[PDB]
Symmetry: C5
Subunit: 311 residues, 5 copies
């Protein structure tokens, strides 16, 4: 067929709704997630109108090839959604109600600055291109926007799913394009990061500081170098569950900062020993005693500064 023609000179309003059935596979590195959802569309096609009293039925079904249907697409998807059309109902006045269930893999960038205490706003951008015959524009039927109460996005809490109601209308390749921004707001379940990464990483650091209550260089080197190695493991573990950002992450900072602490601890340990060998154990012992306070205090100050800067 081809598009409904205008009563006057008005653009065709296509009403939209997304209802999320499943969110899954939030891939931090790819910056993607998968969705399974109802997509609902509604518009006026005069051509399809009818009399309820004459026709005997108050609604009419159609198969999708029978009528004109707007080419709605997702902007930020990897490949075109799989969609199974569920239902098409036309009411007497020629109002069409379309309903598909779809699944798609969606590109949407993530801000890792506060990882792993971060929150994100995922987007699904619906779009339509205007044809020559007629301009098409999108709108949001809020009654058809939602998510079910089970949706679980393993590793994240889901706050809200709402749509920015006013589309962005713009020219692309000499046609009008109308674009809606659906927004899925989430925040990361940070709990497990504490016992699995953060505390272990501290424990190894604090073990490194036992060298400040020790006069054995051979022990000290072993303490500080072994723990430094373990820290690297955690650095590596962490930098692998995350992509290459052009900014420091919060955890990144702490991790990096900690290298400085290991480095300086090695210097102290080196200096202590060097002085003992020159028979200045008195001076050595002042530095060691200072280190016992300076290290943990500066560590604490530094973290407060960092948390201040990142939150």
């Amino acid at each position: 067929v081809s598009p409904p023609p205008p009563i006057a000179d008005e653009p065709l309003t296509v009403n939209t709704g997304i209802y999320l059935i499943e969110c899954y596979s939030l891939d931090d590195k790819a910056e993607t997630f998968k969705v399974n959802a109802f997509l609902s569309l509604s518009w006026k096609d005069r051509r399809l109108a009818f009399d309820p009293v004459r026709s005997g039925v108050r609604v009419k079904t159609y198969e999708p090839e029978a009528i004109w249907i707007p080419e709605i697409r997702f902007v930020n998807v990897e490949n075109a959604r799989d969609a199974d059309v569920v239902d098409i109902s036309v009411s007497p006045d020629g109002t069409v109600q379309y309903l598909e269930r779809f699944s798609a893999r969606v590109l949407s960038p993530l801000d890792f600055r506060r990882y792993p205490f971060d929150s994100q706003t995922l987007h699904i951008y619906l779009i339509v291109r205007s044809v020559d015959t007629r301009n098409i524009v999108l709108a949001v039927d809020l009654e058809k926007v939602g998510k079910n109460d089970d949706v679980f996005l393993t590793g994240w809490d889901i706050e809200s799913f709402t749509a920015v109601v006013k589309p962005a209308n713009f020219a692309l390749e000499d046609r009008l394009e109308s674009k809606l921004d659906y927004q899925l707001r989430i925040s990361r379940q940070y709990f497990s990061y504490i016992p699995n990464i953060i505390l272990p990483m501290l424990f190894i650091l604090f073990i490194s500081w036992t060298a400040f209550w020790s006069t054995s260089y051979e022990a000290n080197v072993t303490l500080v170098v072994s723990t430094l190695i373990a820290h690297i493991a955690f650095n590596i573990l962490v930098e692998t569950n995350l992509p290459a950002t052009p900014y420091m992450t919060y955890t990144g900072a702490i991790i990096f900062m900690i290298y400085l602490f290991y480095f300086v601890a090695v210097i102290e340990v080196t200096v202590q020993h060097y002085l003992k060998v020159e028979s200045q154990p008195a001076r050595a012992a002042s530095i060691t005693r200072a280190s016992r306070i300076a290290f943990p205090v500066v560590f604490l100050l530094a973290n407060i500064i960092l948390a201040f800067l990142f939150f």
Copy 2:
């Protein structure tokens, strides 16, 4: 076509059955599993009735496009199942018997609290949306629910596969939706975790405690720090075969707890040495002797407490 019309204002009952042919790929991290199964549907379409004596045959075949078939979907799947229709039989009174074989990848959340001694209840949710003309409702033909005796779910024992017989009927976007809960109950084969992870992890810990029968700081540091490193490896190995939970897992607890034991062992070892150097080997030696009992005893108490809390 379109749905069979009601004698009077009664909903259409669609009878369901799932018969599992294969379960496989229980992915702990994605919280998914794959299934290969018969799906059976049955319903009354009066329009399709016939006389056996007149028509000459007592059952009639059809191809799926020929008749009306309800749009049954799975709720908790990644993408719509692949289904090949096997057989459609209509009996004289217009009773339709549908049978497909399908495969699907199913989202179903797992409770890791008692891992790896955990059991799970997987769900497959069948659903149908009511049309305008007619309300549809699902029911369970218990004679068509089962699994074959071979279904092996590598890494798990299968207890039962049963369906909750009373559907959950609810409004979604101003239509009735009817949802059945099929339940596959499993429990994890925990055996291999003992030799591969648990005992090794203990053995390294117990080796760390040999420092309590030693006066060599250089040895002790090496004992405790090396074993601590090995423990980290196991922590890492374990946290990678599992997803990020917002709750402690049982194994998680033990693993985390064990870091405290390493930490305190380092303190003891540090203290012992420090006293020897101040010529108080007598006090050192009391602490070392106490540690020999305190460590294993507190370890045992702590584990009893944990197992109590988790089981």
Copy 3:
């Protein structure tokens, strides 16, 4: 169409054959393998019979939608095979000869008890469901069962591919089902496991035993703990190329057993040192001398016992 009706009261025999063109991707963890093969089917459809003199050709081609073809399926596949039909020939008497080339990923469980000296029997189960009108039964044309001379399963030797000729006929959901068992018998190329895993693992163990010719506790601890760590690496490497079994594997046993040897070596080393410090180097030295023989002898006995128990 629908199935050929019987001359008398006999079930329809569908003759089968599988000819393997490629085996590949034996995935130990998933317990799957991939196959690329001819599937050959043959049956009598009288309805399709014809005169060579009238029709002008001596055999007739068809496209699969044109005629009735039995719904033959694989039982133990992940998803339905990709099949490209190669040829359908119907001979004058209505004898159909079907030939597809297919590929599928096949579930078939593996017994890891003697890994990596294990052999396996893979299965491909062909099946057909009987319709209402007619009972269908499968049989094996032995002349159409085989494999290519160059079919290779990287990491395995292929012994035989044969079919159990007598189907298993049984009721499922009130219809007859007929099931054939094709069997691919293989055995693992164990060679590479010797230089890459087994010997290294021994070498590190034997290095640990050099502590029996040493009086340096600091050295000994380092010897035994470092090698123990290397052993863990191999344990981890091995447990990752394999799934979680509810039984001990042979290699698993050895690996696990070896932890006990490391543990006891640490005890010996600890004891030796403790006695030296109490000025009983004489007793220490007896234990050390005994250990030099006891360890390797008990190791040998233990392995003989294990190999006996597993083979």
Copy 4:
């Protein structure tokens, strides 16, 4: 149908445009990236011309099977693009305007010489094969070449997307082929490599040099060998995020160079000790003092030389 015939004897010009909607998945190892884009085509088909005054409309839609459309393909793709046709408009003079949205995975080699400070030029090669009846040739409508302002290629900055306007026309299998080069110019966000890899790698190296202020062989060996091990980890980490090049990468050089520094540090440490044992601590001490300056100075010179050679 088949191609438009020429007014005279001129080749058929097909005008092209690519508008990038999404770039993603730049896989360094595979040397690929994924794209989602509009492809626009335009050409003259006289046969389709019409009178605006007679026909009543000034533009005509068609479905793709209705008219002749050139077989445009991508050269450097893994498999043929998924394309959904968006719009086909024909203007009175028989000028066709084609528009598809496509997605494809594109092979395009990367030069790793300056990694991770590298820039790249990705290519998308459009191509068309001439038929017997007519020569077909491609051209670039610059007004239909662009990318939207959001395109984000996680880990990279995007400079430009432009097309080389003059096609390369050449014989392949005795027909003319016409090929356009679209060019996406990018440069790597190198920031994260500094804190995650580069600085750590230096810090461990500088720690190794503390052995130059130490007289303990047992400590020194531990310092230098442990840090060497950590360096290997980083070598391994790095060589895994990259493919096997037949040329040195910049980072590769530094990494490799650093092994020489560890090697020589071990020699120094070995020599120092050997002399102390022969009661020549005076000579030892000159070498150690020299090493304190020589190592960092030569390290600096060497890096300047390398950066000069690579930039």
Copy 5:
């Protein structure tokens, strides 16, 4: 339709050609590679002949469903190729020229004996099954065999792509099958293996030998055991980029051999110490001095022997 019938009693010659557009993804472990290529076919169908002077055109196009086309298949592919048909031209005498572009994933075994200095011969086997009506045979049009000059197979140099011109004709399931062997000859770019694996592995080994200029058992144990651990890492790294072969690889040998050197170095170090403790430092010192020459000399001899045996 069905096949062209013979003028006399001759088999139908189908002329073939493969022109490689892209080679990629040479996966060493799977022993596969991916290809993107033109497949060209040519044969005589008398039925399609025509008069150029009468018909007015010297060539005729067809769509593939219109005419008979031989079922050419690849033998050694995972799944049937994706193919888009490009062009079908028929010349007056009924000579058909077919051209598709395809992509496929190809199984072809690799000989790892000389890795990573190995060369390989990849195969693509084209095949055709004869029908009842007619025998089909394949041949190679050498003018349609080639690859473009860009084909880059990341990690490999490409020597040649040629076809063995004489097919192998043989019986399979009582029909003739005709099989062509296309051969892609490649050799591995070994350069990067030197700096990334081989030299590091030597450097660690040579560091182990510094224990021959040292009298400290505690140092020596640390030197030799730490380096042994690093060697294991490289063994593991290497055995993971490769499959399980039933033969020694060259690199495998060296790696394995090197374990023996570490083992014996531990024995030497153990012996040296044991003698020092029994106050025989004189004998110890002879063995240590011998080791300084024996180790590197035997290492060199052994490698010469191995390279001789493998090349």
